[PDB]
């Protein structure tokens, strides 16, 4: 889950604070919504749940260019990881993300180890260009804040938050 200040990427360059989606959402609530949001690719998909998870310890992931998102320790963001030497997309939890890591950013809102790597469908998802791989600068505590998340109909179970790629959730 992520803090209320987080901007969800809506189609046509639009966006909205995740706390503004169901204004006055009760803490620890399940909320049915009907909202088009951008997926990991800039394609519109359906969000049909707005979750208010209540007060949780949160942490701010900040990149070296100053992109940032604040969320819980168990919040999954899409990162670019070296598995064998093959660069690949894995979900790291915020509590396991550390400096030098590379966050995947959806450029629609604004490739390390790949050239040393060279299997074209590989460097086509990556060099898709609708992406951007930002080096993490820090992950610092941010006290206890109200957090939110969405349920999406997308097939990758993802949606955009502050340019970051966040993972679908089924409950608050």
């Amino acid at each position: 889950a992520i803090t209320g200040d987080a901007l969800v990427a809506l189609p046509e360059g639009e966006s909205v604070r995740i706390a503004d989606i169901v204004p006055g959402a009760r803490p620890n609530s399940d909320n049915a919504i009907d909202l088009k949001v951008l997926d990991r690719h800039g394609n519109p998909v359906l969000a049909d749940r707005l979750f208010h998870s209540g007060e949780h310890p949160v942490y701010t992931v900040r990149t070296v260019e100053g992109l940032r998102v604040t969320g819980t320790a168990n919040h999954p963001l899409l990162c670019l990881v070296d598995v064998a030497g093959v660069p690949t997309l894995l979900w790291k939890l915020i509590d396991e993300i550390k400096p030098g890591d590379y966050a995947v950013i959806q450029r629609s809102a604004f490739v390390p180890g790949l050239v040393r790597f060279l299997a074209q469908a590989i460097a086509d998802e990556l060099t898709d260009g609708r992406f951007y791989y930002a080096k993490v600068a820090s992950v610092t505590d941010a006290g206890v804040q109200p957090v939110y998340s969405l349920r999406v109909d997308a097939c990758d179970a993802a949606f955009i938050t502050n340019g970051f790629v966040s993972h679908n959730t089924e409950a608050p």
């Binding site: 889950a1 998870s53 168990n74 999954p76 979900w91 179970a157 959730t169 089924e170 409950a171």
Partner: peptide, 4 residues
């Protein structure tokens, strides 16, 4: 994480 996925469940939430």
């Amino acid at each position: 994480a996925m469940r939430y």
